[PDB]
C-alpha cells in the first residue's frame, strides 16, 4: 500500500485543492489531518469568535469528507512530535501541504520537510493560498518586493495567475483510495469543542458569521449576483451600503481558505465577461484579491514584518506607551460612539467594514491616542475572524503612516467620519443600546447634548457611558505635529 496524509492548515477545502489532488493520485489510502495543540490553545491570545470559526471549519470538512466515506482527523499535539509517530503508525509515504509563505510557516514546513526526509517520505506542495508565485513578483521587480501598491499593480498586470481551479475532490475518486477509519475515530480524532479549547461557552448566541467550505460556496453564490446588479447600472436596494455583517461577505473564507483565492478570481473574471460582455476586465475587480497579494509579497521574505523595531521596511516612530488608553480603545470604552460601535461590532462579531477598520485604526494611532499600530495589529488578531499575520500588519503599517508609502490621506475624524457615514446613527443605537435614547443630531456627540436631552435619553454622559477620552481636535493637531516633526 501507498499511503497518503493531506495536512490542512490554511487551505480548508476540497475544492481548488491541488495539493491534495495530487496526494491522492497514485495513493491506496488517504487520511487527512489537521493538527491542533489545545494545551497551546489555553495560552491563545484569540478570542472565541476566532476558535469558533476555525472549528465550525474543521467541523465542515469532517461533514463533506464523509460525504466521501472518509473523516477528518484532528491531532492534538505540535506538528513536530506529531508527524515521525504518524509516519510510522500509518506507514505513510507521501505528505501533502498547501504552501505558506509567511516567514513562520516557511520556518516549520522546512522543519517537516527534513523530518519526513529523513523518513524517506515524499512532500507534496503546491501554491493555493495566494494567485501567483511570490517569488516571481519579486524578481520583476529588480529582486525586491514592491513597496507600494502602485509597483504590485504595475508588475501584477503583466502577469497571469499560475493556474485556473482545479476540480472539487468527488465520489470518483475516493471510491478508489480508501480511508481506515476505527470505531473510536470521534473519540480520538474528532473535532474539538470550545469547551475542550478553555471558553465559556454560555450564553453564546449563533454565529454571524458560520465557517466553512459550504457557507464559502454558498456565499460565493450570492456574492456573484449583488456584483452583477451594481454592475448594471441597476435601481437602488435599501441594503447597498451596510456596516454591517455582509451575508455575502467573503473575506473569513478566504483567509482560512473556505473559498479559493483562484476560484474567486476566474468567477469574477466571467461575471465581468458575461455582465459587462468585456474580455479583459480592469484590475480594480480584483481589489480585494491583489492587495492580499501585495501584502503576502511583502512579509515572505521578513520574519520581523509584525513588528516596528528591527523591521527593514518600517518608519520608526515615537509612539506612547499607554495600557489604559489601549484598553479603552480595545474594549470600546473611548466615549466616541462612533469608535465604540466598530470595536462592540468586531468584538461581538469578529468582522467589520474596511472603512470602519481605517476609523478605528485611525483613532489608535496617528489620529488621536498615538499608539503603536503593533497594538492594534494585536487586537485585530485576537477578535477579526479574517485577519492575516502579513495583510494586518501590512495595513496596520500602511494606515499609521510606517510603511507603503502611497495613498497619503487624511485621518478621519471619530464624530464626522461616522456623522457622514450613517446619518441618523442606528448604528451606534445598534451597538450601544445604551445611547439608543439620543437624537441624530447628538448621537455621535452625547457630551454636547443638553442635561435634558440626556436625562430623556435615560444616559448620562460620564456615568451610565464614558466621557469621551481625548479632546480629538488638540490631540490630532498635536499628532499632525508629532508626524511631520519626524518626516521634516
Same mark, same amino acid.
Given at each position: 500500500?501507498?499511503?497518503?496524509?493531506?495536512?490542512?492548515?490554511?487551505?480548508?477545502?476540497?475544492?481548488?485543492?491541488?495539493?491534495?489532488?495530487?496526494?491522492?493520485?497514485?495513493?491506496?489510502?488517504?487520511?487527512?489531518?489537521?493538527?491542533?495543540?489545545?494545551? =497551546?490553545?489555553?495560552?491563545?491570545?484569540?478570542?472565541?469568535?476566532?476558535?469558533? =470559526?476555525?472549528?465550525?471549519?474543521?467541523?465542515?470538512?469532517?461533514?463533506?469528507?464523509?460525504?466521501?466515506?472518509?473523516?477528518?482527523?484532528?491531532?492534538?499535539?505540535?506538528?513536530?512530535?506529531?508527524?515521525?509517530?504518524?509516519? %510510522?503508525?500509518?506507514?505513510?509515504?507521501?505528505?501533502?501541504?498547501? *504552501?505558506?509563505?509567511?516567514?513562520?510557516?516557511?520556518?516549520?514546513?522546512?522543519?517537516?520537510?527534513?523530518?519526513?526526509?529523513?523518513?524517506?517520505?515524499?512532500?507534496?506542495?503546491?501554491?493555493?493560498?495566494?494567485?501567483?508565485?511570490?517569488?516571481?513578483? +519579486?524578481?520583476?521587480?529588480?529582486?525586491?518586493?514592491?513597496? $507600494? *501598491?502602485?509597483?504590485?499593480?504595475?508588475?501584477?498586470? @503583466?502577469?497571469?495567475?499560475?493556474?485556473?481551479?482545479?476540480?472539487?475532490? $468527488?465520489?470518483?475518486?475516493?471510491?478508489?483510495?480508501? $480511508?481506515?477509519?476505527?470505531?473510536?475515530?470521534?473519540?480520538?480524532?474528532?473535532?474539538?469543542?470550545?469547551?475542550?479549547?478553555?471558553?465559556?461557552?454560555?450564553?453564546?448566541?449563533?454565529?454571524?458569521?458560520?465557517?466553512?467550505?459550504?457557507?464559502?460556496?454558498? @456565499?460565493?453564490?450570492?456574492?456573484?449576483?449583488?456584483?452583477?446588479?451594481?454592475?448594471?447600472?441597476?435601481?437602488? @436596494?435599501?441594503?447597498?451600503?451596510?456596516?454591517?455583517?455582509?451575508?455575502?461577505?467573503?473575506?473569513?473564507?478566504?483567509?482560512?481558505?473556505?473559498?479559493?483565492?483562484?476560484?474567486?478570481?476566474?468567477?469574477? $473574471?466571467?461575471?465581468?465577461?458575461?455582465?459587462?460582455?468585456?474580455?479583459?476586465?480592469?484590475?480594480?475587480?480584483?481589489?480585494?484579491?491583489?492587495?492580499?497579494?501585495? =501584502?503576502?509579497?511583502?512579509?515572505?521574505?521578513?520574519?520581523?514584518?509584525? %513588528?516596528?523595531?528591527?523591521?527593514? +521596511?518600517?518608519?520608526?516612530?515615537?509612539?506612547? /506607551?499607554?495600557?489604559?488608553?489601549?484598553?479603552? #480603545?480595545?474594549?470600546?470604552?473611548?466615549?466616541?460612539?462612533? +469608535?465604540?460601535? +466598530?470595536?462592540?461590532?468586531?468584538?461581538?462579531?469578529? #468582522?467589520?467594514?474596511?472603512?470602519?477598520?481605517?476609523?478605528?485604526?485611525?483613532?489608535?494611532?496617528?489620529?488621536?491616542?498615538?499608539?503603536?499600530?503593533?497594538?492594534?495589529?494585536?487586537?485585530?488578531?485576537?477578535?477579526?475572524?479574517?485577519?492575516? #499575520?502579513?495583510?494586518?500588519?501590512?495595513? #496596520?503599517?500602511?494606515?499609521?503612516?510606517?510603511? =507603503?508609502?502611497?495613498?497619503?490621506?487624511?485621518?478621519?475624524?471619530?464624530?464626522?467620519?461616522?456623522?457622514?457615514?450613517?446619518?441618523?446613527?442606528? *448604528?451606534?443605537?445598534?451597538?450601544?443600546?445604551?445611547?439608543?435614547?439620543?437624537?441624530?443630531?447628538?448621537?455621535?456627540?452625547?457630551?454636547?447634548?443638553?442635561?435634558?436631552?440626556?436625562?430623556?435619553?435615560?444616559?448620562?454622559?460620564?456615568?451610565?457611558?464614558? /466621557?469621551?477620552?481625548?479632546?480629538?481636535?488638540?490631540?490630532?493637531?498635536?499628532?499632525?505635529?508629532?508626524? %511631520?516633526?519626524? *518626516?521634516?
Amino acid at each position: 500500500g501507498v499511503n497518503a496524509v493531506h495536512w490542512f492548515r490554511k487551505g480548508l477545502r476540497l475544492h481548488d485543492n491541488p495539493a491534495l489532488r495530487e496526494c491522492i493520485q497514485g495513493a491506496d489510502t488517504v487520511r487527512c489531518v489537521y493538527i491542533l495543540d489545545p494545551w =497551546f490553545a489555553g495560552s491563545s491570545n484569540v478570542g472565541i469568535n476566532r476558535w469558533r =470559526f476555525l472549528l465550525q471549519c474543521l467541523e465542515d470538512l469532517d461533514a463533506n469528507l464523509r460525504k466521501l466515506n472518509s473523516r477528518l482527523f484532528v491531532i492534538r499535539g505540535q506538528p513536530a512530535d506529531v508527524f515521525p509517530r504518524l509516519f %510510522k503508525e500509518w506507514n505513510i509515504a507521501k505528505l501533502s501541504i498547501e *504552501y505558506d509563505s509567511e516567514p513562520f510557516g516557511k520556518e516549520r514546513d522546512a522543519a517537516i520537510k527534513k523530518l519526513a526526509s529523513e523518513a524517506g517520505v515524499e512532500v507534496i506542495v503546491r501554491i493555493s493560498h495566494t494567485l501567483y508565485d511570490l517569488d516571481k513578483i +519579486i524578481e520583476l521587480n529588480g529582486g525586491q518586493p514592491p513597496l $507600494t *501598491y502602485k509597483r504590485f499593480q504595475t508588475l501584477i498586470s @503583466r502577469m497571469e495567475p499560475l493556474e485556473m481551479p482545479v476540480e472539487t475532490i $468527488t465520489p470518483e475518486v475516493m471510491k478508489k483510495c480508501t $480511508t481506515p477509519v476505527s470505531d473510536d475515530h470521534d473519540e480520538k480524532y474528532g473535532v474539538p469543542s470550545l469547551e475542550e479549547l478553555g471558553f465559556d461557552t454560555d450564553g453564546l448566541p449563533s454565529a454571524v458569521w458560520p465557517g466553512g467550505e459550504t457557507e464559502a460556496l454558498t @456565499r460565493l453564490e450570492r456574492h456573484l449576483e449583488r456584483k452583477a446588479w451594481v454592475a448594471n447600472f441597476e435601481r437602488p @436596494r435599501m441594503n447597498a451600503n451596510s456596516l454591517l455583517a455582509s451575508p455575502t461577505g467573503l473575506s473569513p473564507y478566504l483567509r482560512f481558505g473556505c473559498l479559493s483565492c483562484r476560484l474567486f478570481y476566474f468567477k469574477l $473574471t466571467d461575471l465581468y465577461k458575461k455582465v459587462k460582455k468585456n474580455s479583459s476586465p480592469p484590475l480594480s475587480l480584483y481589489g480585494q484579491l491583489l492587495w492580499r497579494e501585495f =501584502f503576502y509579497t511583502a512579509a515572505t521574505n521578513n520574519p520581523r514584518f509584525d %513588528k516596528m523595531e528591527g523591521n527593514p +521596511i518600517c518608519v520608526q516612530i515615537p509612539w506612547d /506607551k499607554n495600557p489604559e488608553a489601549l484598553a479603552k #480603545w480595545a474594549e470600546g470604552r473611548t466615549g466616541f460612539p462612533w +469608535i465604540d460601535a +466598530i470595536m462592540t461590532q468586531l468584538r461581538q462579531e469578529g #468582522w467589520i467594514h474596511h472603512l470602519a477598520r481605517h476609523a478605528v485604526a485611525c483613532f489608535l494611532t496617528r489620529g488621536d491616542l498615538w499608539i503603536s499600530w503593533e497594538e492594534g495589529m494585536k487586537v485585530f488578531e485576537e477578535l477579526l475572524l479574517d485577519a492575516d #499575520w502579513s495583510v494586518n500588519a501590512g495595513s #496596520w503599517m500602511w494606515l499609521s503612516c510606517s510603511s =507603503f508609502f502611497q495613498q497619503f490621506f487624511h485621518c478621519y475624524c471619530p464624530v464626522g467620519f461616522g456623522r457622514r457615514t450613517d446619518p441618523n446613527g442606528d *448604528y451606534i443605537r445598534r451597538y450601544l443600546p445604551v445611547l439608543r435614547g439620543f437624537p441624530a443630531k447628538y448621537i455621535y456627540d452625547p457630551w454636547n447634548a443638553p442635561e435634558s436631552i440626556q436625562k430623556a435619553a435615560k444616559c448620562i454622559i460620564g456615568v451610565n457611558y464614558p /466621557k469621551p477620552m481625548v479632546n480629538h481636535a488638540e490631540a490630532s493637531r498635536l499628532n499632525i505635529e508629532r508626524m %511631520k516633526q519626524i *518626516y521634516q
